[PDB]
């Protein structure tokens, strides 16, 4: 007569690492590094805006591609790889800071400046670079000012926008840089051009420069965009001689949201809190090896393919 104590084992153990052993065999184990994600942006529960081919900058100045995204509310803003900001070729100063400001916003309202120009000014400049409804157009929120009588000096002009609201406004403008002297003269006259902009928290001077440069979308001239924030109650004044690309509406970034840059199609029927270029990560594991670049509430990226957590005893087979 006899009685014996023992523990179970299995035929096929799992290797795990310990403080003392690289190759320790246990009964069961489980992954702690998430390696699979969802190939969709899971936008269920989110007021989301898929921008398509509209670049966030394009929303503020009104590039044709952003016509559907000039105002709105969102808690999540999706930027896409093909995104268009500029129809008429040019660039924006501190562009990435501005892109990030838009991408953390929770919406945008548009507020008319109310600028009016006298009879010497043609405020309806359009271009084949900005098509809209099969026709020559221009940035929706901006106006291309030129001399109404061609080759005449654009008149000394003063325009003032007053923020009568309770939150800050983001105002954008452009500075036309013609591509030749003939064109500068036709549009603004032979006079020396000067544009100065000022508020309580901003002052600058701009001068259109004529320069030969490569054609972009058929065009050798450029439009440089500038922007500043106009605080409540404050006023900003444009004083210009020709070359100002004047704002007809200004912007108001509202609230907060999560900015996402992704390739992945939206699934408005699944939920997630963690996003990346390829879509979403929905997991309970504390680590992941999918992508070092995520946004939202994510597990932490680790440089490991696998990390096994033993969930059983040492496996000693018969």
């Amino acid at each position: 007569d006899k009685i014996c104590l023992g523990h179970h084992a299995v035929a096929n153990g799992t290797i795990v690492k310990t403080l003392t052993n690289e190759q320790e065999e246990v009964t069961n184990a489980t992954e702690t590094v998430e390696s699979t994600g969802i190939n969709r942006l899971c936008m269920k529960g989110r007021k989301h805006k898929d921008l398509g081919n509209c670049h966030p900058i394009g929303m503020l100045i009104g590039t044709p591609a952003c016509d559907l995204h000039l105002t709105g509310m969102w808690d999540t803003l999706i930027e896409r790889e093909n995104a268009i900001a500029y129809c008429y070729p040019g660039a924006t100063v501190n562009v990435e800071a501005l892109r990030q400001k838009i991408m953390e916003s929770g919406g945008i309202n548009k507020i008319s400046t109310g600028f009016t120009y006298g009879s010497s000014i043609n405020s309806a400049g359009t271009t084949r670079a900005c098509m809209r409804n099969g026709g020559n157009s221009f940035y929706a929120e901006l106006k291309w000012l030129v001399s109404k009588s061609a080759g005449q000096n654009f008149p000394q002009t003063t325009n003032t926008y007053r923020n009568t609201d309770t939150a800050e406004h983001l105002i954008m403008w452009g500075i036309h840089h013609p591509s030749s002297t003939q064109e500068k003269n036709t549009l603004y006259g032979t006079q020396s051009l000067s544009i100065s902009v000022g508020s309580s928290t901003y002052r600058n001077n701009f001068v259109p420069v004529v320069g030969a440069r490569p054609q972009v979308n058929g065009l050798s001239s450029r439009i440089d965009f500038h922007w500043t924030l106009v605080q409540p109650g404050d006023n900003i004044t444009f004083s210009h001689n020709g070359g100002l690309i004047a704002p007809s509406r200004v912007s108001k970034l509202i609230g907060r949201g999560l900015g996402i840059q992704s390739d992945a199609p939206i699934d408005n029927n699944c939920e997630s809190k963690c996003f990346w270029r390829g879509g979403s990560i929905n997991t309970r594991l504390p680590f992941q090896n999918l992508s070092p670049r995520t946004v939202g509430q994510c597990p932490k990226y680790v440089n490991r393919r696998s990390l096994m957590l033993a969930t059983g005893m040492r496996n000693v087979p018969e």
Binding site: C4, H7, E104, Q261, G296, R304
Partner: protein
């Protein structure tokens, strides 16, 4: 290490699909096997605990500081790279250490719940039994299947068999 599971016990029992720890008895009426429920649940409960802690993490919202689709100014990009990589080295290191230390405790914990069962049965048997080196108790009286159950059931009354047992040990 508590000297049992990969120690004085030769190996595990692939046949015991009933639980983590158990008994195999031999008496006149043959052999038999039963897994001990309390012990296996003691170990299992501790495992599921580690697992709960593993997935507890409630998390901070992060936003992008790296453009996926446009270029980032070089110097700030280099600072961001150096930071993100430093952070990732830290997490990689913490993940590795978390798993390794946790795996050490998990194994040794399981070794422990097994030694604890063993010791309970050893004290329970008192002077009616002796140990071989390999995790069995040579019982020095006839033990009934009903008696065997009372050893696992933890209701075995050692005084009942002591006289008989003691004679056999000394003769």
């Amino acid at each position: 290490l508590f000297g049992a599971i990969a120690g004085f016990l030769e190996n595990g029992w692939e046949g015991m699909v009933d639980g983590w720890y158990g008994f195999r008895h031999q008496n006149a009426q043959g052999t038999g096997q039963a897994a001990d429920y309390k012990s296996t649940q003691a170990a299992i409960d501790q495992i599921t605990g580690k697992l709960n802690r593993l997935v507890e993490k409630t998390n901070t919202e992060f936003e992008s500081i790296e453009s996926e689709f446009s270029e980032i100014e070089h110097q700030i990009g280099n600072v961001i790279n150096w930071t993100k990589d430093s952070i990732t080295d830290i997490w990689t290191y913490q993940a590795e250490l978390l798993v390794a230390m946790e795996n050490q405790h998990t194994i040794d914990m399981a070794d422990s719940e097994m030694l604890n069962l063993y010791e309970r049965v050893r004290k329970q048997l008192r002077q009616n039994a002796e140990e071989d080196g390999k995790g069995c108790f040579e019982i020095y009286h006839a033990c009934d299947d009903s008696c065997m159950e009372s050893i696992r059931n933890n209701t075995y009354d050692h005084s009942q068999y002591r006289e008989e047992a003691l004679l056999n040990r000394l003769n």
